[PDB]
């Protein structure tokens, strides 16, 4: 199993326990989500209203139960996500993956950034110079980069991870 953050609940919507959901539209394809500090909750219903998305969780049947979950992070089990085509990735799911070079862990993905024509992994990890440690950048789609289910492997390019 592996949980990845897909969003956070906003304020309750209407009176039956529905909650605004702020985060990934992929939630529309799920049947359950793990709620921070509370455990799995089956999704009983969800829908769009204008540009918002509202989720109804099993057992969250009024505003009082809903308020207890406002602001909490929401997670998906990776195995639950619709499979993507080759060469495509769920960015939110890459966050937190350990990054290795020749089998030695050199850091972990903390975010993904845009550098015009390519998506770039932001990695926190090693470095001879302190300022290079927290913002090391590696192009996600580079041929010297290999994304696997639970880790990312990068070739020992000279001057990449110094």
From Swiss-Prot:
InterPro entries named in the record: PRC-brl_dom, PRC_barrel-like_sf, RimM, RimM_N, RimM_N_sf, Transl_B-barrel_sf
Major localization listed first in the record, in broad terms: cytoplasm
Keyword line: Chaperone, Cytoplasm, Ribosome biogenesis, rRNA processing
Localization annotation: Cytoplasm
Molecular function per GO: ribosome binding
Pfam families documented for this protein: PRC (PF05239), RimM (PF01782)
PRC barrel domain mapped to chain residues: 86-160
GO terms, biological process: ribosomal small subunit biogenesis; rRNA processing
The organism's place on the tree of life at top rank: Bacteria
GO CC list: cytoplasm; ribosome
Family statement drawn from the similarity comment of this UniProt entry: Belongs to the RimM family.
Entry note about domains: The isolated N-terminus (residues 1-80) forms a closed, 6-stranded beta barrel; it probably has the same form in full-length protein. The PRC barrel domain binds ribosomal protein uS19.
Functional description taken from the UniProt entry: An accessory protein needed during the final step in the assembly of 30S ribosomal subunit, possibly for assembly of the head region. Essential for efficient processing of 16S rRNA. May be needed both before and after RbfA during the maturation of 16S rRNA. It has affinity for free ribosomal 30S subunits but not for 70S ribosomes.
Subunit details: Binds ribosomal protein uS19.
Name of the protein in question: Ribosome maturation factor RimM
Lineage, top ranks: Bacteria, Thermotogati, Deinococcota, Deinococci, Thermales
